[PDB]
Amino acid sequence: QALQKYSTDLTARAREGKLDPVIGRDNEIRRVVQVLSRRTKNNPVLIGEPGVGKTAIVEGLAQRIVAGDVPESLRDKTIVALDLGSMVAGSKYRGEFEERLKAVLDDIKNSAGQIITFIDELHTIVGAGATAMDAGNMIKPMLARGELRLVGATTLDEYRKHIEKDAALERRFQQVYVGEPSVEDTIGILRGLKDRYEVHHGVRITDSALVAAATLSDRYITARFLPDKAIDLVDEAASRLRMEIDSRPVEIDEVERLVRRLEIEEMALSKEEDEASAERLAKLRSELADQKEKLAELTTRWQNEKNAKEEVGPDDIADVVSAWTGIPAGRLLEGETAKLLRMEDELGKRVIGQKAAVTAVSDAVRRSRAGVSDPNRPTGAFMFLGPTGVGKTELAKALADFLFDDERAMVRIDM
Amino acid sequence: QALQKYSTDLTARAREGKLDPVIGRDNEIRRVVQVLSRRTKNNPVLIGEPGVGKTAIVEGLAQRIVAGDVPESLRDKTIVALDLGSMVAGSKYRGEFEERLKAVLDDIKNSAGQIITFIDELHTIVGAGADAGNMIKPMLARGELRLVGATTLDEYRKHIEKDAALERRFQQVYVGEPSVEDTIGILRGLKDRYEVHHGVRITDSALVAAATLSDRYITARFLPDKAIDLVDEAASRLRMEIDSRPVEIDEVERLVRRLEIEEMALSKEEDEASAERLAKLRSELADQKEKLAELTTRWQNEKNAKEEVGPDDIADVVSAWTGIPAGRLLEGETAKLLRMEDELGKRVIGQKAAVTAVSDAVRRSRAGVSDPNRPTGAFMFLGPTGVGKTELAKALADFLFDDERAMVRIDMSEYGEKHTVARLIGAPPGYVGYEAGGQLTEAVRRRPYTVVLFDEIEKAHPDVFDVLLQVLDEGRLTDGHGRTVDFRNTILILTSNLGSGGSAEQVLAAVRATFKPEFINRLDDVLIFEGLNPEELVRIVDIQLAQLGKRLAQRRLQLQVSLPAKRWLAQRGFDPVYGARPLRRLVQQAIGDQLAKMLLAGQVHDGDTVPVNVSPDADSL
Amino acid sequence: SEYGEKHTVARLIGAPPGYVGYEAGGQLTEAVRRRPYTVVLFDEIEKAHPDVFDVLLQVLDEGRLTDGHGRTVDFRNTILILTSNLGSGGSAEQVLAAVRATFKPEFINRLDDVLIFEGLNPEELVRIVDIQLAQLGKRLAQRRLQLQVSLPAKRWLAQRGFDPVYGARPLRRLVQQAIGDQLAKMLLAGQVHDGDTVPVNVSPDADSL
Numbered sequence A: 001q002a003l004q005k006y007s008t009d010l011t012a013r014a015r016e017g018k019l020d021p022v023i024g025r026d027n028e029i030r031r032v033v034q035v036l037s038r039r040t041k042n043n044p045v046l047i048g049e050p051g052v053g054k055t056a057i058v059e060g061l062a063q064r065i066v067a068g069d070v071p072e073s074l075r076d077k078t079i080v081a082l083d084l085g086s087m088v089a090g091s092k093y094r095g096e097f098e099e100r101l102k103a104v105l106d107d108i109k110n111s112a113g114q115i116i117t118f119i120d121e122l123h124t125i126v127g128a129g130a131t132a133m134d135a136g137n138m139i140k141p142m143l144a145r146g147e148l149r150l151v152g153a154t155t156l157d158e159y160r161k162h163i164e165k166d167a168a169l170e171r172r173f174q175q176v177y178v179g180e181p182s183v184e185d186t187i188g189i190l191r192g193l194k195d196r197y198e199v200h201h202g203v204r205i206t207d208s209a210l211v212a213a214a215t216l217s218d219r220y221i222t223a224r225f226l227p228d229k230a231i232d233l234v235d236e237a238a239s240r241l242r243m244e245i246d247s248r249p250v251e252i253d254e255v256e257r258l259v260r261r262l263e264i265e266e267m268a269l270s271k272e273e274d275e276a277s278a279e280r281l282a283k284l285r286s287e288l289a290d291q292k293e294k295l296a297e298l299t300t301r302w303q304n305e306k307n308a309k310e311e312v313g314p315d316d317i318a319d320v321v322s323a324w325t326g327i328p329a330g331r332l333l334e335g336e337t338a339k340l341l342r343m344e345d346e347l348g349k350r351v352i353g354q355k356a357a358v359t360a361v362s363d364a365v366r367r368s369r370a371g372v373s374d375p376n377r378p379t380g381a382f383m384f385l386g387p388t389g390v391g392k393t394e395l396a397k398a399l400a401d402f403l404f405d406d407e408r409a410m411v412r413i414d415m
Numbered sequence B: 001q002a003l004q005k006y007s008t009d010l011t012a013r014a015r016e017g018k019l020d021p022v023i024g025r026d027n028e029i030r031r032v033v034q035v036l037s038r039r040t041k042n043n044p045v046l047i048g049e050p051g052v053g054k055t056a057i058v059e060g061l062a063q064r065i066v067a068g069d070v071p072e073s074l075r076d077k078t079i080v081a082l083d084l085g086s087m088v089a090g091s092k093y094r095g096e097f098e099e100r101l102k103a104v105l106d107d108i109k110n111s112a113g114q115i116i117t118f119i120d121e122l123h124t125i126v127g128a129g130a131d132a133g134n135m136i137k138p139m140l141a142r143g144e145l146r147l148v149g150a151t152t153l154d155e156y157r158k159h160i161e162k163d164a165a166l167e168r169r170f171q172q173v174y175v176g177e178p179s180v181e182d183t184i185g186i187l188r189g190l191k192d193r194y195e196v197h198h199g200v201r202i203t204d205s206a207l208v209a210a211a212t213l214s215d216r217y218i219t220a221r222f223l224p225d226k227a228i229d230l231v232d233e234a235a236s237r238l239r240m241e242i243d244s245r246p247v248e249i250d251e252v253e254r255l256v257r258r259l260e261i262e263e264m265a266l267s268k269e270e271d272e273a274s275a276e277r278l279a280k281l282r283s284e285l286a287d288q289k290e291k292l293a294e295l296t297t298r299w300q301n302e303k304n305a306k307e308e309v310g311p312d313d314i315a316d317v318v319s320a321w322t323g324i325p326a327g328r329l330l331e332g333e334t335a336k337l338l339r340m341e342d343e344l345g346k347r348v349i350g351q352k353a354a355v356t357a358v359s360d361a362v363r364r365s366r367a368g369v370s371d372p373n374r375p376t377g378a379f380m381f382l383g384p385t386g387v388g389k390t391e392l393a394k395a396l397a398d399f400l401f402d403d404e405r406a407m408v409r410i411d412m413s414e415y416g417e418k419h420t421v422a423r424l425i426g427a428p429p430g431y432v433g434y435e436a437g438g439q440l441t442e443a444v445r446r447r448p449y450t451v452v453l454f455d456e457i458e459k460a461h462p463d464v465f466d467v468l469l470q471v472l473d474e475g476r477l478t479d480g481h482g483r484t485v486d487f488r489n490t491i492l493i494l495t496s497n498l499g500s501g502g503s504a505e506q507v508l509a510a511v512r513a514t515f516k517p518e519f520i521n522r523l524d525d526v527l528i529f530e531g532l533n534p535e536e537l538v539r540i541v542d543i544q545l546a547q548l549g550k551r552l553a554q555r556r557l558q559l560q561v562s563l564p565a566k567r568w569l570a571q572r573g574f575d576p577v578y579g580a581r582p583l584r585r586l587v588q589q590a591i592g593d594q595l596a597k598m599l600l601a602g603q604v605h606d607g608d609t610v611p612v613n614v615s616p617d618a619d620s621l
Numbered sequence C: 001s002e003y004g005e006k007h008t009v010a011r012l013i014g015a016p017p018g019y020v021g022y023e024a025g026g027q028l029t030e031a032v033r034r035r036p037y038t039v040v041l042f043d044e045i046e047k048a049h050p051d052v053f054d055v056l057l058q059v060l061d062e063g064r065l066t067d068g069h070g071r072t073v074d075f076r077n078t079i080l081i082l083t084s085n086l087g088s089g090g091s092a093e094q095v096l097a098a099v100r101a102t103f104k105p106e107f108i109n110r111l112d113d114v115l116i117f118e119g120l121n122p123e124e125l126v127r128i129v130d131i132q133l134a135q136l137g138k139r140l141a142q143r144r145l146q147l148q149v150s151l152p153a154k155r156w157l158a159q160r161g162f163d164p165v166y167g168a169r170p171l172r173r174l175v176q177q178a179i180g181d182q183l184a185k186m187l188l189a190g191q192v193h194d195g196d197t198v199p200v201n202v203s204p205d206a207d208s209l
């Protein structure tokens, strides 16, 4: 009965239908099962970089046990998820922790080898109760005889920072290397996960969304790993779309919020007894008017669309990938096609002459938004030289301003 | 009666036949005996690396006592297994643990030496305090309690040797690991205990392989233990196969029962770009439902006319582990190896002398002919620029792993100063970055099958060469933490750009004057690359156009190219001093620029197909 | 060839008290503090930094050194061996001159005889050819595939790879390139199934099986 108090039940939740579906990864679950059913030292440890799916495999094994796809030895085994945090809760006295540990071990042993314990992030088991090495290695006699099974899973570099420093305990563990999947596999994963999200957020999701997410999340976000940085885009897109099925969409709610601030400023700046703030007001009014025009236009266009956007598509994902890691990944939604066609004449406002070099920079900027340049190569690498005072540094500073509206936003180093 | 509460009975467990047969190790047990049977200070301690068998020796001694092979000074003595953990269980009050331990010690002394206390993991005897594990120090030095302990080699000097007053009362017994010939015998003795638990049979030709094979592939662990896992796993897998269908008939069915649902929920997509994906997935499904039904037929051809493990299940296990493929070329891989300079030729063009040398040290290693202790192949190819010598090392890492970014590349141009060596080997203990290991080292210790690439090697400082000096020719280098990492399965590739135009001995003598003979001598053939003839550019043209086309299929947007343009581009591939890089700029100056201009100016939309045609000088879409 | 800086001496001696890697002790020490009958080998001693040379000062001719923990291990039963490649171009004066220029007098004075190796002669390569062939046969004896080499073959093999500037590794690479390639192409293309004894013989330039 100590188990009932110091651990939860995984297989029970698997029966009650509360674990996400698990797709693919057949070799890994096969190896986990065959290691989990050998004579001595049956303790598989899923190891590998963070995010690639290591708890998902154990959940898949649990659902598989509930279904019946397991061999004979693993029929009705009742996986158990330990918890060493709630075990060291209040034990300030001398034996209060070893007592609980002995109780749990005894109740695991009393069962006829049924229980399959599961310690998630087992790199925390090392220094369980310190004071002088005594605790956390009381299970070391039972690991060897294979009484308790203990399928665990830790990240790849907290296994050689915490455990491999304890070569006597690493010996009792078998490593199952979980490498990350490819884009073709991630698409398949998403195709089966595209229902829980689609039901939690009251929306629908096109298959093009899944494809484009699994591709862009690999092309751009080069700091995480694949089964997760692809689910995040889908999830945020769906949440945003549900937020817009509220009263108003974006790009109308932003303009009205701007208009309100401009109004509350123009109403309280009017009663200013000065002469220099007269011109500092003469522009604020014009701005308020030119913004209210846009508000009214958008509001009228919405009415037309509503009398004459309900699922996420392959471009809302681009909006997310642009809002996070501000690389523009869109599809030229008419806001800036005119701008990129005017680029030369616009960079002419600050630089004069050297059309032979302005056109060369503009072409490299242009053929990258249309999706034609090499996706794994810099967006352009020019070295323009010539005599002094001509304008080379000036063109470089004009380009950064035309792109980000702040010449202090580019990275400059003086070689 | 207090020894019943805090300890089990090893000798009784050995009487009912509950312990594994212990084989060999005569000297260790005889020394344990002749230490355990002296006047004072009669308590040994076994010492040695984890896994080499140190509880096995105590269990062997217990079975030996039960049989009666021991001398008169030990005939009819029981061994009790003390359990320090179950003594501090409830002792929150200020003296209860000391009371318990004192009762235990008094009861041990109350007998006349008919008990031999055996403490396992005795490095845990230092604590128990909060003046504990210290009241034992008097009775130790007099020989009252006969203590048999066994801790690993490096927790000894961490918990015990710190207390030279207590480590004086112990006589050390070193337990070195066995050899291959002895491990074979140990397995020959232990086989019939797994033969029962798993309802299978194990072949002696497999017992020899599970010990010869696990001695050149798994170096992070020690002997027998790293050789019993293979046998046990092979047997468990064979039993799984016996119950259900065999493997490679199970996964083919699992993925087929998934592609079904995929295409079923996909066919309901009111979309147009998703029709090219559905009509491509619907072909792999019918292709898999073909070889599945072929396997079910080829299985009955055997089931009408694989029942014990052999030297093949062991190799399959030690291959699923550690990733290293050591199998038997199961007729699907050999057909692929036989045409390798044909699958490499789809990405590298020309350089027949070099493709038939990289590809030549993979076959002669997969067939079991190469030296088992030296890298799979270590050769440097060098020549002029833009020729294809960093591309070959990527067409090769893609043939073997199906992913160009699963290999280990280090750009040796950042190693300009000699102190930049610590970047790939770690920093010695007591310094800033030490709990991080090396950087090249920790990359191979996790997957010892990658293909390392040292790009632009002559730009570095001539000390990193001397670091590499032992990587070649032995496949070993140890980092700060003192962990030896093996390279005996990687493929070492070093690019360069020396010479730059010299025919053959302006370059062969420029290598000789930048490297030392002891470094040139470890290498395999030094491959020389050659410039690009005008003929072998008309084909790179096709490769480039295919690349761009595949890049364009994100919009279902094709393009038709006429042979005049295709041979115009290749004739404007110029200057046999810059190789094949100018062509990739020519393509984007000609086609890509105006395509992108037309693409965001309306007048070209998705699904279209634009034909190129050679205007009298330029290209027109 | 890795001990190239001052601070990499703490790699074989441990760390001074109170620092990061302290419970780990030394690396040369903790393997000669137990079972002190081993053999110590320093490859390419001249690749180091001439401050590692001054730990071997009290290692040699006194037989003890003290790690970080203060313990004193004793080297009174080991056999130290240092290899190098100094000179490599002079007959007998350049090697000694380079040694005297790269080491200290109180370091060359501690050792026993500083031996010189000669360099293999054309006669001394047949006795290596048969060694290599026996080793290779032992390798491809795990499939009962023992070779059967002809005496003209052995003489050609000991005449092709000889060049007196790279020692005896060219012979190994030649054995591989000549025999192993043909054998591996013949082995996985059927026709050389196990339990076979393939003979090798001399063709004009190559040597066909």
Ligand SMILES: Nc1ncnc2c1ncn2[C@@H]1O[C@H](COP(=O)(O)OP(=O)(O)OP(O)(O)=S)[C@@H](O)[C@H]1O
Residues within 6 Å of the ligand: A020, A021, A022, A023, A024, A025, A049, A050, A051, A052, A053, A054, A055, A056, A154, A155, A189, A193, A227, A228, A231
């Ligand atoms: N094969 C898979 N099938 C279904 N969902 C998967 C699969 N692999 C990963 N996921 C999902 O992707 C996410 C991966 O999270 P987890 O794998 O549980 O985290 P992790 O891989 O254990 O990494 P850590 O170390 O636990 S934070 C979860 O949302 C999973 O539901």
Ligand SMILES: Nc1ncnc2c1ncn2[C@@H]1O[C@H](COP(=O)(O)OP(=O)(O)OP(O)(O)=S)[C@@H](O)[C@H]1O
Residues within 6 Å of the ligand: A350, A351, A352, A353, A387, A388, A389, A390, A391, A392, A393, A394, A395
């Ligand atoms: N074509 C031009 N259009 C506009 N301003 C220009 C032009 N050429 C020069 N200038 C002015 O000249 C200033 C200095 O020119 P820079 O380009 O900064 O000097 P530079 O071209 O970098 O030559 P060096 O070799 O670096 S001194 C700029 O800040 C501009 O104000």
Ligand SMILES: Nc1ncnc2c1ncn2[C@@H]1O[C@H](COP(=O)(O)OP(=O)(O)OP(O)(O)=S)[C@@H](O)[C@H]1O
Residues within 6 Å of the ligand: A040, A144, A168, A169, A171, B020, B021, B022, B023, B024, B025, B049, B050, B051, B052, B053, B054, B055, B056, B151, B152, B186, B190, B224, B225, B228
């Ligand atoms: N001489 C031997 N005869 C038979 N089996 C042996 C022998 N030596 C080891 N084994 C087996 O190999 C394994 C070794 O496990 P143990 O020796 O109990 O662990 P250990 O050697 O004590 O290492 P530590 O320090 O306890 S983690 C067990 O399965 C033993 O049954």
Ligand SMILES: Nc1ncnc2c1ncn2[C@@H]1O[C@H](COP(=O)(O)OP(=O)(O)OP(O)(O)=S)[C@@H](O)[C@H]1O
Residues within 6 Å of the ligand: B347, B348, B349, B350, B384, B385, B386, B387, B388, B389, B390, B391, B495, B496, B497, B540, B579, B580, B581, B584
């Ligand atoms: N023989 C070739 N076959 C196919 N592509 C080639 C060939 N030679 C060069 N390339 C192209 O050239 C680029 C790679 O050239 P690399 O070989 O990597 O340059 P390199 O040979 O390393 O010369 P350096 O000294 O490193 S600049 C890719 O875009 C390849 O497509």
